[PDB]
Paper text:
NoV VP1 can be divided into two major domains: the N-terminal shell (S) domain and the C-terminal protruding (P) domain. The P domains form the outermost, dimeric protrusions of NoV virions, which plays critical roles in receptor recognition and host immune responses. HuNoVs recognize human histo-blood group antigens (HBGAs) as host receptors or attachment factors that play an important role in huNoV host susceptibility. In this study, we provided both phenotypic and structural evidence to show that huNoV DSV and VA115 recognize a group of glycans with terminal galactoses as ligands.
The results showed that two oligosaccharides (117 and 373) bound well to both DSV/VA115 P-GST fusion proteins with significantly higher binding signals compared with the remaining 583 oligosaccharides. Interestingly, only one oligosaccharide molecule bound in each asymmetric unit of the complex structures, since the remaining oligosaccharide binding pockets contain steric hindrance for oligosaccharides at crystal packing interface. The positions of the glycan binding pockets were located at the outermost surface of the P protein near the interface between the two P monomers, similar to the typical HBGA binding sites of other GI huNoVs. The binding interface of VA115 P protein resembles that of DSV, in which its “bottom” is also composed of the four conserved residues D332, H334, S389, and P390. Similarly, in VA115 the Gal forms five direct hydrogen bonds with four conserved amino acids, D332, H334, S389, and P390, as well as G394 at the position corresponding to Q393 of the DSV P protein that does not participate in direct interaction. P390A of VA115 was the only mutation that did not change the glycan binding ability of the mutant P protein, presumably because this residue interacts with the trisaccharide through its main chain carbonyl group. The structural data showed that the two GI.3 huNoVs bound non-HBGA glycans using terminal Gal as the MaBS, explaining the mechanism why these huNoVs could not bind HBGAs.
Author numbering:
A (entry chain D): 231 to 410, 414 to 533
B (entry chain A): 231 to 533
Write the structure that this text describes.
């Protein structure tokens, strides 16, 4: 039988950045289509895009340093050191999906070292030499690292594109994985009947973010892990959820979780919808309903 | 009904550092006693020490910058910004438990910013002014940050203690959480091997460690996703130990027997050499078999 975690949202992680859920929101400006590659999972527990099981795999890169004429960078592997297979994902699992911005990362050797001198602040730009699908990315800060040095890089902060084609960091945009083409997790659309996609918002270090520090995702990481663990057969077109008060277990709103692993509500006329709900509530599965089951409006 | 995650180990996180499980081991040198404060949970889902629900809360510090008595640091809060209550727990939830080393962290404001110039490389030393239990730590790299600037710091790497009292980083050692007596601090209790040839199973992950006693390796007593699972399930503990099989999901073979105790740690009986689970593959899955007595004798594991 299908279930969602009985865990308060404010204790759970974003599925695109390793950061606690701070709020829920709907977006009129950005909610018409998203194609996030992290936080992508079916309700019967099939991982999609670059989505890992663990939050500890999120926004990390592993590779061997290459030195090329007018570029240095990484020949990419999976985080565990094993080969990257194109038949599995558009990039190695846990690869960041924050498109069209600079990635400021801390890179360390995957071999035992004595001193912090071998730890490098690197900058990955999304320009011509950004080709994760082809297994190669260019990175600044590697000029003094020996060729074939194996390193793990962890995303620290993001800033506007070095080439200046954008003024801000747009956390709704995914990368262009590179091609000469990647099998992306499919686009998510609001399915009609006044329904808006629910976004789980977390703060991440972003210089000039369109929404300041806020990064949206379509499902908490611990929900991803739960579905992968349970492998519950999908026995309906949508799973009806209640968002409960953690003290009283009283119903604060109705939500539909679709087989494609994203969630919707109908926001109240006023505007905000789930944004006015408290963030220490718990989702509970009620029953399977049709994809045209009409939800009561949520919020003020 | 009690269960453990049906997920391969190599896809799961260490519960002390946010890093994938690379191997299992028993420890002759360190396995007689551990008192890790992260990865601490009962089988019926009670969090202990500083253990968070989420791997994303691990090895993070949140606080407001102070300048006092020629030393700079943080008045600590919980990671969600809510107040840290002193004299109640060893430290805020997710606070690192890597004792007697320097913590090199990246600190960023919890308020929107325009430039990366506000992002600071800080060093937290475990010296006289390291008092997380009292809700205060000192850090190098904060002299140029305005008083009351609210920041989250994320652990990047650790190195030997600046004061030189130790030559390497020992990842088996927990912090001294103030000038308070360890007995008066509200620590998750010590874990002992329970007898009958049983050794504590340690889940090993690589973390960026300069001059580590075990190189990059950090041990923990349970995968983070196991912690979350027990907190979610709240399964009543109906036995003295939970018997597990470690299965190869590809070959359909039982690779070894393990006992998971109510205190949330796992044991095996290692072979004569004492290498035990270290030779097992890391892509296996644990499954709950049944509740057994503390005297239930396990088949030896390894080579
Ligand atoms: O050995 C203690 C200490 O080592 C590093 O500090 C050294 C410093 O002692 C030396 O004089 O200069 C180098 C070059 O930058 C380092 O700053 C670590 O930084 C420190 O955390 C501690 O591990």
């Amino acid at each position: 039988p299908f279930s969602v975690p009985n865990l308060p949202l404010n204790t759970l992680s974003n599925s695109r950045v390793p950061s606690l859920i701070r709020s829920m929101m709907v977006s009129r400006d950005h909610g018409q289509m998203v194609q996030f590659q992290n936080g992508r999972v079916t309700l019967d527990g099939q991982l999609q895009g670059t989505t890992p099981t663990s939050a500890s795999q999120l926004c990390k890169i592993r590779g061997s340093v290459f030195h090329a004429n007018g570029g240095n960078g990484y020949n990419l592997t999976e985080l565990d050191g094993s080969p990257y297979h194109a038949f599995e994902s558009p990039a190695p699992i846990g690869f960041p999906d924050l498109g069209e911005c600079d990635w400021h990362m801390e890179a360390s050797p995957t071999t035992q070292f004595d001193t912090g001198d071998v730890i490098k602040q690197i900058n990955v730009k999304q320009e011509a030499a950004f080709a994760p699908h082809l297994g190669t990315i260019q990175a600044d800060g590697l000029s003094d690292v020996s060729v074939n040095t194996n390193m793990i890089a962890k995303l620290g902060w993001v800033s506007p594109a070095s080439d200046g084609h954008r003024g801000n960091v747009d956390p709704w945009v995914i990368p262009r994985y590179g091609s000469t083409a990647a099998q992306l997790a499919p686009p998510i659309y609001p399915p009609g009947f006044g329904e808006a996609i629910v976004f789980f918002m977390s703060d991440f270090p972003i210089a000039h973010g369109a929404n300041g520090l806020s990064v949206p995702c379509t499902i908490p990481q611990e929900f991803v892990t739960h579905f992968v663990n349970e492998q519950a057969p999908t026995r309906g077109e949508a799973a009806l959820l209640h968002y409960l008060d953690p003290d009283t277990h009283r119903n604060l709103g109705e939500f539909k979780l679709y087989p494609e692993g994203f969630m919707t509500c109908v926001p109240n006329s006023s505007g905000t919808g789930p944004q006015t709900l408290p963030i220490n509530g718990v989702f509970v599965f009620v029953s399977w309903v049709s994809r045209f089951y009409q939800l009561k409006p949520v919020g003020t």
